[PDB]
Amino acid sequence: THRFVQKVEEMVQNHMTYSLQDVGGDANWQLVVEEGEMKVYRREVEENGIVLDPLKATHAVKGVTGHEVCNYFWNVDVRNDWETTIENFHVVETLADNAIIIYQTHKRVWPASQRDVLYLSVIRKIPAENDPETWIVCNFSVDHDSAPLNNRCVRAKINVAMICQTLVSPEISRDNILCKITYVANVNPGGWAPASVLRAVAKREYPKFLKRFTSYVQEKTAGKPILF
Numbered sequence: 001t002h003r004f005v006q007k008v009e010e011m012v013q014n015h016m017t018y019s020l021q022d023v024g025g026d027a028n029w030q031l032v033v034e035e036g037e038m039k040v041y042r043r044e045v046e047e048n049g050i051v052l053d054p055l056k057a058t059h060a061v062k063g064v065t066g067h068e069v070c071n072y073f074w075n076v077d078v079r080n081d082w083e084t085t086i087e088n089f090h091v092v093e094t095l096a097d098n099a100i101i102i103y104q105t106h107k108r109v110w111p112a113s114q115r116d117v118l119y120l121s122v123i124r125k126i127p128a129e130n131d132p133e134t135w136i137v138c139n140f141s142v143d144h145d146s147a148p149l150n151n152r153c154v155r156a157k158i159n160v161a162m163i164c165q166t167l168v169s170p171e172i173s174r175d176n177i178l179c180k181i182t183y184v185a186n187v188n189p190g191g192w193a194p195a196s197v198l199r200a201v202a203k204r205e206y207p208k209f210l211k212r213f214t215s216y217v218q219e220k221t222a223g224k225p226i227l228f
């Protein structure tokens with residue numbers, strides 16, 4: 001269909017192959033924050049003095065499906081109900097009914113300069129018979145000609161996936177469904193930013209995002225028919 005179909009397939013397949021792997025047994029991942037089933041890990045990585053620290057988190061959210069969690073993560077129309085770090089966003093291009101290109105600016109965290117991002121966002125169902133089906137959203141930086149001029153901003157590059165598998169434990173009720181998330185984010189912030197700032201913002205904002213976002217999906221879907 002669109003011009004990014006092959007690249008999308010490739011990003012989605014790399015995440016299904018690598019990002020889903022369990023890291024409980026992997027000492028290369030540092031476990032930074034645990035709050036119940038919410039477990040947030042990082043690797044400490046710098047390229048030319050820029051912090052790139054890979055983020056990887058798992059969570060287990062009662063009462064919602066993967067399909068639902070991924071719709072809410074992907075659907076631009078509900079972005080302001082859960083995002084707390086975005087100043088502005090514009091849909092730059094609609095590629096298909098499951099893929100768009102988005103421009104957004106993040107709120108400045110003093111004393112770093114503000115960051116903007118230009119990324120393709122795609123939502124995909126990955127079919128399983130002994131395995132679970134998966135819903136995934138991948139957001140990854142692309143180049144585009146309708147990129148704004150924004151001289152307040154350094155351009156960050158991202159490769160993020162929200163990957164969800166759904167457990168139903170034997171008319172199915174929300175009480176019987178559990179969504180397992182794996183969330184990964186590799187962000188090159190560009191430019192320079194104090195390493196302490198980058199790291200404090202990650203450490204604060206990723207767990208806050210995961211709590212907030214997953215509670216929002218629980219809240220919006222409760223009392224609604226289950227969308228498997």
Ligand SMILES: CCCCCc1ccc(-c2ccc(S(=O)(=O)CCO)cc2)cc1[C@H]1C[C@H]1c1ccccn1
Pocket residue numbers: 085106109112113115117139156158160185187189193197198201202205206209
């Ligand atoms: C001086 C601070 C530099 C800002 C660097 C930066 C840029 C984008 C992003 C980011 C971009 C996309 C996503 S998402 O999951 O795809 C949802 C859609 O928005 C998530 C996080 C992260 C960071 C890193 C700080 C870290 C941080 C973490 C959670 C919120 C804000 N900042």
